[PDB]
Amino acid sequence: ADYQGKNVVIIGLGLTGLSCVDFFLARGVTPRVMDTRMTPPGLDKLPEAVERHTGSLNDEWLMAADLIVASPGIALAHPSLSAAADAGIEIVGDIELFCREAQAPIVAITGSSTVTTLVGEMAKAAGVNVGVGGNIGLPALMLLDDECELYVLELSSFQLETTSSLQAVAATILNVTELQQYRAAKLRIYENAKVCVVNADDALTMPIRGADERCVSFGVNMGDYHLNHQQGETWLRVKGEKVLNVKEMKLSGQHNYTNALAALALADAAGLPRASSLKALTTFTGLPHRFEVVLEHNGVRWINDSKATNVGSTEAALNGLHVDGTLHLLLGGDGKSADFSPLARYLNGDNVRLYCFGRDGAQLAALRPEVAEQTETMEQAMRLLAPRVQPGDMVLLSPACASLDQFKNFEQRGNEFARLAKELGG
């Protein structure tokens, strides 16, 4: 849309509020920001030209606004917002701002992560540049920067409440778990959807009406997409046909089989090739910290392999690793008396750069010091490479060491890497 010369107020900062600020600053609009918290997150990232008010809502700013952009964290029933609404002031959310500008198909998912991640993996297996965001990953507005061909948004009922311009190529309510108002907000995801993917085992996921010929179902024993145990084997079944033995999947358990069925039905409805999507089901592990993609933005892939607390596990990550551009590898920690020389056969070539840290970091940078860097902690290493990273590059944390020298456990090192990937790469 055109927001030129409008008084815009953003309620709620954080990364989402920051994305709205950038969204408007890039369209010639300087917004005003307010947040009930005295020191909200992202306050230090907030530009200087932007007026901000913290510790409470500025009711005058709201009543004076032409457009109120409300984070899902503030209740729309709040008296100031209720008064703004009664005064005829337009209230929207960040997702509404996204859907007005999005030029690529949108897949929309709501219902009490894996489904959203799988759909993204299926699009990637088909060579589709996909932006995964919303209630997970990056905020939706930050996906407009890249050159996406498909959007996959995980949405809350709160985000849906303030969204009116969503026309998803495929939408789903996975579950409605603790009421009729809660369901009503979630059903908004179906409005103007080309295909509605519903849960055969949860009737509240079905539209009340107006979806007679655009519904596709997933379920355990029933639905267009369901499971079937026949000749002693369990099969994924799609539109009456066996398409995959669940033993080819890395994921396991009934819940992950229904997750795969739901993700498959969205990807099929969005036009992704079945063959490439089924392949994604055979490669996706969903293991935290084990070659876990934590951020895909601006053509860069940030991969958290903090689970590699030994030389053998890092060698596995490097072995057969195709990186279109530059691999930015981080190495360090407590090596635990390990010999890292076997890693050298994978660290030759032009596209390798090393960023070493931790207790045994000095010993790890000694694999090819000419193209290597050294630091004390993981954070300052990532701030060195973040300016240097360009599209096609991979930022891989396969440290080959345990994290007990500077971390509670390898999980903390992997979570900290994901936190800094969002800041540095977004």
From Swiss-Prot:
GO terms for cellular component: cytoplasm. Coiled coil: none annotated. Keywords: ATP-binding, Cell cycle, Cell division, Cell shape, Cell wall biogenesis/degradation, Cytoplasm, Ligase, Nucleotide-binding, Peptidoglycan synthesis. Its main location: cytoplasm. Pathway: Cell wall biogenesis; peptidoglycan biosynthesis. Optimum pH is 9.0. Cell wall formation. Catalyzes the addition of glutamate to the nucleotide precursor UDP-N-acetylmuramoyl-L-alanine (UMA). Belongs to the MurCDEF family. This is UDP-N-acetylmuramoylalanine--D-glutamate ligase. The lineage of its organism: Bacteria, Pseudomonadati, Pseudomonadota, Gammaproteobacteria, Enterobacterales.
